[PDB]
CSV table of C-alpha atoms in Angstrom, one decimal:
chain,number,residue,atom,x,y,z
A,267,UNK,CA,1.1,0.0,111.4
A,268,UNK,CA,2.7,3.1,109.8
A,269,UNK,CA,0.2,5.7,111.7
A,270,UNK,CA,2.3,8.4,114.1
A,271,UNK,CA,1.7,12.4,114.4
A,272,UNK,CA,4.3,15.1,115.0
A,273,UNK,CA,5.8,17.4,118.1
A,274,UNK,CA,4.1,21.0,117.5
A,275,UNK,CA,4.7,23.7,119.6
A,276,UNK,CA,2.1,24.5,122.1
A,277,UNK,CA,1.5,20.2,122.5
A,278,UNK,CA,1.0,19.4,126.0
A,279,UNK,CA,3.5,16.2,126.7
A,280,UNK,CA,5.2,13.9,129.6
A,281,UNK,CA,8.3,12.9,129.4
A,282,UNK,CA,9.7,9.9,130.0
A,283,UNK,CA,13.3,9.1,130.6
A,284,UNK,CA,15.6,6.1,130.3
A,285,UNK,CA,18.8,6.7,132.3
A,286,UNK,CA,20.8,6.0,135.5
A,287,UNK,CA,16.8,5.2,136.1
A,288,UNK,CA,13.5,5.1,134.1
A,289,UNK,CA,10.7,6.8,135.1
A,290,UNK,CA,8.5,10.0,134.5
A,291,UNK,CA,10.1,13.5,134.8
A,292,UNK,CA,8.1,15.3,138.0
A,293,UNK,CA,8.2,17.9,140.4
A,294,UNK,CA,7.5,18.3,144.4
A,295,UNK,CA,4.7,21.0,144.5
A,296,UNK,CA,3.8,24.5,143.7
A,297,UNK,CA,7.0,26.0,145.8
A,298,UNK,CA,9.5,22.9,145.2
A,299,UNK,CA,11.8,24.1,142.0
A,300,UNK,CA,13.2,20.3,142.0
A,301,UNK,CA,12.9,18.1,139.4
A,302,UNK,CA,12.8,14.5,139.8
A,303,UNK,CA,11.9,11.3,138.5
A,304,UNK,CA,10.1,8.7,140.7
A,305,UNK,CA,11.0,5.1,139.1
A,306,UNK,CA,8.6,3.2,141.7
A,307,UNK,CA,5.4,6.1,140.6
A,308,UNK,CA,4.8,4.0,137.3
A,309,UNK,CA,5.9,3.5,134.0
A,310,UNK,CA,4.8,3.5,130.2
A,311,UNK,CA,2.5,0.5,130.9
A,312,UNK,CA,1.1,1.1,134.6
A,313,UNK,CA,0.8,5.3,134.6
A,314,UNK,CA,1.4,7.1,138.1
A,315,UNK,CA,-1.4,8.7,140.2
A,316,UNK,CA,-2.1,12.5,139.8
A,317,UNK,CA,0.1,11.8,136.3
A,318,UNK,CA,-1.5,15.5,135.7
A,319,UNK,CA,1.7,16.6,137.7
A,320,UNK,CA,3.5,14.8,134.7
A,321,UNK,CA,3.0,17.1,131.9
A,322,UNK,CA,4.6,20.1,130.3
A,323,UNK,CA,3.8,22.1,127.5
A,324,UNK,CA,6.3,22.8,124.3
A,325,UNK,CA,7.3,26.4,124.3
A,326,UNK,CA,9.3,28.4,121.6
A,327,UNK,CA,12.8,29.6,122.6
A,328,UNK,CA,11.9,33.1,124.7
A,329,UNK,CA,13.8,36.2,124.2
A,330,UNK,CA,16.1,36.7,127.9
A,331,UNK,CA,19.1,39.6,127.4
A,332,UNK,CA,16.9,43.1,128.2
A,333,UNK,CA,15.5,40.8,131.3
A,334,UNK,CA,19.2,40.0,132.1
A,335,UNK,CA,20.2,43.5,131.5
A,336,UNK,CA,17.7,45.1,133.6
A,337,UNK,CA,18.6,42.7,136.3
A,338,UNK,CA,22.1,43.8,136.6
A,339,UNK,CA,20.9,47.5,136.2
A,340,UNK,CA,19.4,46.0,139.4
A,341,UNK,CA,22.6,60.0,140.1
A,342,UNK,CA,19.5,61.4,137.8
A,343,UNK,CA,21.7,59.7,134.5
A,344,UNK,CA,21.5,56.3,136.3
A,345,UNK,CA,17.7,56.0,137.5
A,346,UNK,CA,16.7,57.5,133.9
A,347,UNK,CA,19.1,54.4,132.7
A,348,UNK,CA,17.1,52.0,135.2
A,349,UNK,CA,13.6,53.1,134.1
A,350,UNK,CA,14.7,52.8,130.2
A,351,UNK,CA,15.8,49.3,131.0
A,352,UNK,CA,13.2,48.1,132.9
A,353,UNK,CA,10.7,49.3,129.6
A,354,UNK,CA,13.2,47.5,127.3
A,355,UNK,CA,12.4,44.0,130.1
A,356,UNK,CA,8.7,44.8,129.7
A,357,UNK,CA,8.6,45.1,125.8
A,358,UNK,CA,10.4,42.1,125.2
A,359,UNK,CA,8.5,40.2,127.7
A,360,UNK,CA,5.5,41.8,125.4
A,361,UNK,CA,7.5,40.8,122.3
A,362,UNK,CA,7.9,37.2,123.3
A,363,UNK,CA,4.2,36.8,123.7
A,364,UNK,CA,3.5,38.3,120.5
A,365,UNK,CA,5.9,35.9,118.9
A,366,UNK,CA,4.9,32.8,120.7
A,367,UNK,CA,1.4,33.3,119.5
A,368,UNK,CA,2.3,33.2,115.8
A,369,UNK,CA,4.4,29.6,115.9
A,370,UNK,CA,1.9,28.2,117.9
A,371,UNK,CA,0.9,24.7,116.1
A,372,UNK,CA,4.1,24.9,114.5
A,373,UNK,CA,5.9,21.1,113.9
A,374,UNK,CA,8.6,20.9,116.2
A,375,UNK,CA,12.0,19.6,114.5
A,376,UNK,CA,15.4,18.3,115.4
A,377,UNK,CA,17.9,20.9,116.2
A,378,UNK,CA,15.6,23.7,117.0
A,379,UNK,CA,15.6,25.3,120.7
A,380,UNK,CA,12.2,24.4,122.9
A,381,UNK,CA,11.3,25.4,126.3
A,382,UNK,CA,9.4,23.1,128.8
A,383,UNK,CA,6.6,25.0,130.7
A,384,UNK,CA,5.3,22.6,134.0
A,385,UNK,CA,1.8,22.9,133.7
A,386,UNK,CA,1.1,22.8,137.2
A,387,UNK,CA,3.5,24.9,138.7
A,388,UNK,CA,3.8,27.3,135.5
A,389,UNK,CA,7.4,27.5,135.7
A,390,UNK,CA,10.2,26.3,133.0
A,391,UNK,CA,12.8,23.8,133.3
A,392,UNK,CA,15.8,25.6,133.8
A,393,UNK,CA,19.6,24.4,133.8
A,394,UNK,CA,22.1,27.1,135.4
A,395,UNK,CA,25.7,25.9,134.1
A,396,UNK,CA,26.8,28.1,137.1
A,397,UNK,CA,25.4,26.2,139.9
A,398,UNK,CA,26.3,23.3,140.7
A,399,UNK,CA,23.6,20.8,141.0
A,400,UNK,CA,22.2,19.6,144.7
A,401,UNK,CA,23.5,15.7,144.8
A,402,UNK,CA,25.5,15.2,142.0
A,403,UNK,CA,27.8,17.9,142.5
A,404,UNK,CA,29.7,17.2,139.1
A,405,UNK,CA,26.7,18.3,137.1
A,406,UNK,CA,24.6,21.1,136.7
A,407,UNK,CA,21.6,21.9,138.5
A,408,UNK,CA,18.0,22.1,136.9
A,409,UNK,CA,15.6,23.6,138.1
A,410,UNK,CA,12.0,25.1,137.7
A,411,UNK,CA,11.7,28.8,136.9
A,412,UNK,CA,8.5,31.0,136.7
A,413,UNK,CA,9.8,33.6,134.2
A,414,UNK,CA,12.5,31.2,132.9
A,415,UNK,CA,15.9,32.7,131.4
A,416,UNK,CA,18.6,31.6,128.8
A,417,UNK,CA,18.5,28.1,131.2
A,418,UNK,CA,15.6,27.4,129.9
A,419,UNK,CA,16.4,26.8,126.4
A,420,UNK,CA,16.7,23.6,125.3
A,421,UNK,CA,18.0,21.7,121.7
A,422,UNK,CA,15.8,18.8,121.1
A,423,UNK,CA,18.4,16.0,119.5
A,424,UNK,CA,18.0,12.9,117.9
A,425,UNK,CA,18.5,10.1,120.2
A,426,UNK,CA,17.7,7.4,117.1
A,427,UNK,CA,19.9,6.5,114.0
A,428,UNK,CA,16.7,6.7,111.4
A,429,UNK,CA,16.0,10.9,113.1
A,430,UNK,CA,18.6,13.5,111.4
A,431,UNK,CA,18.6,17.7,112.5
A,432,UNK,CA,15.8,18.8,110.6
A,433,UNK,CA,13.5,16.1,110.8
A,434,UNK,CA,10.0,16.3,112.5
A,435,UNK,CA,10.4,15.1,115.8
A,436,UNK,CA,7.6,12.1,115.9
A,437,UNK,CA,5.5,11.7,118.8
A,438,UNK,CA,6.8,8.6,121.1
A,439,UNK,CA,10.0,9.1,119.7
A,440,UNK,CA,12.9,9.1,122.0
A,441,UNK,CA,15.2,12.2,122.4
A,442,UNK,CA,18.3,13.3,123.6
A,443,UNK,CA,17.3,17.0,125.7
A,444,UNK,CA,20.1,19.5,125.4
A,445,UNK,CA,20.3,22.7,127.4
A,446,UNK,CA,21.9,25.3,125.1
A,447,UNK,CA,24.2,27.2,127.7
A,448,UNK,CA,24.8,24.2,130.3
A,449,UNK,CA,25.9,22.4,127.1
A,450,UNK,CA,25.3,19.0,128.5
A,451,UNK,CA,22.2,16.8,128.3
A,452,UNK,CA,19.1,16.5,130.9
A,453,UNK,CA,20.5,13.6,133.1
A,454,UNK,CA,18.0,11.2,135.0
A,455,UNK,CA,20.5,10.0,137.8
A,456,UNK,CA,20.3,7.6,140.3
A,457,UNK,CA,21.1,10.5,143.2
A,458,UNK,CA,17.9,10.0,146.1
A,459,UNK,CA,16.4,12.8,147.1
A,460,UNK,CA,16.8,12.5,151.3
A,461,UNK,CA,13.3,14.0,152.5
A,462,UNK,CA,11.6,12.6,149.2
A,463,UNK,CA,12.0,8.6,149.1
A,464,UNK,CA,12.2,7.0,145.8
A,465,UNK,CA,12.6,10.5,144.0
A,466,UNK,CA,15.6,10.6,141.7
A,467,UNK,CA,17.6,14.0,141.1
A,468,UNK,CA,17.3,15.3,137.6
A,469,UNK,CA,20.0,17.4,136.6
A,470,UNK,CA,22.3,18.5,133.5
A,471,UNK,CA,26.0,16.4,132.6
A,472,UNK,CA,27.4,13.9,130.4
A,473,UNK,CA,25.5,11.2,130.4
A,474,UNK,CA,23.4,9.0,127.9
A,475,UNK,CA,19.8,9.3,129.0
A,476,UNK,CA,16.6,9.1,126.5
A,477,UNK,CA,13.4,11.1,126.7
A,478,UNK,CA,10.4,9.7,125.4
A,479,UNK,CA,8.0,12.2,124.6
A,480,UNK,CA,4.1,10.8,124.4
A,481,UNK,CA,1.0,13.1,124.1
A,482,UNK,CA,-1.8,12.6,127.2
């Protein structure tokens, strides 16, 4: 009764939360960059149908400030500025994959920085702390992002009194998912979506939910 495995990076995983409302963090589509959790879809016990749609994979925290810089980038000294920028974009999109490959299988602990990648829809959870999220327009909107940015980072915090910062993070374990610029937690609320029925908003604010992370 004492068996259990670890979080390592590159681990595909669902995630389920215990909130405003319990259910299974998911998405609307290919296009849709809403997140949502669907209480009625299933639960630990009863899975929910195409629960493929349920899973993300655990990514290392990506390198974001010469993609940010190029994008404000957007006179011969000013397009020789934009093309050197765009290279220093392209290299450290280059860098990250080089990186990510060499922490892949790597144990996963409390108090590091993960990214989510939906498998499905290839795109990050991202929390912007500057937008204002859909429903609950005292948090902070999440999203899904293909290339991902500095929203995308997210500290992976005990939620239990027996887990400390630099522990393993176990598999099954329940955790508290903190975006490192919006500065509050991943919130399942109780806000229904109005052209979605029985889909929940997910978004980023004070709050107290859990995440349960399980393998498939």
């Amino acid at each position: 009764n004492e068996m259990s495995s670890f979080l390592h990076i590159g681990d595909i995983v669902s995630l389920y939360a215990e909130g405003s409302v319990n259910g299974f963090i998911s998405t609307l589509g290919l296009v849709d960059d809403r997140c949502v959790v669907e209480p009625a879809a299933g639960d630990l016990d009863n899975p929910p149908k195409k629960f493929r749609d349920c899973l993300f994979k655990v990514c290392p925290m990506n390198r974001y400030s010469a993609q940010k810089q190029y994008w404000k980038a957007k006179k011969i000294a000013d397009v020789v500025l934009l093309q050197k920028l765009q290279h220093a974009a392209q290299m450290e999109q280059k860098q990250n994959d080089t990186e990510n490959k060499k922490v892949h299988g790597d144990v996963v602990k409390y108090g590091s920085v993960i990214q989510l990648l939906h498998m499905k829809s290839n795109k990050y959870l991202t929390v912007n702390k500057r937008l204002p999220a859909l429903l609950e327009k005292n948090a902070m909107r999440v999203t899904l992002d293909a290339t991902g940015n500095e929203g995308s980072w997210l500290f992976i915090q005990p939620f239990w009194k027996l887990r400390s910062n630099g522990d393993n993070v176990v598999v099954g374990d329940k955790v508290i998912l903190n975006p490192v610029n919006a500065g509050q937690p991943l919130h399942a609320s109780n806000y229904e979506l109005s052209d979605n029925a029985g889909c929940k908003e997910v978004n980023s604010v004070n709050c107290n939910t859990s995440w349960k992370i399980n393998l498939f």
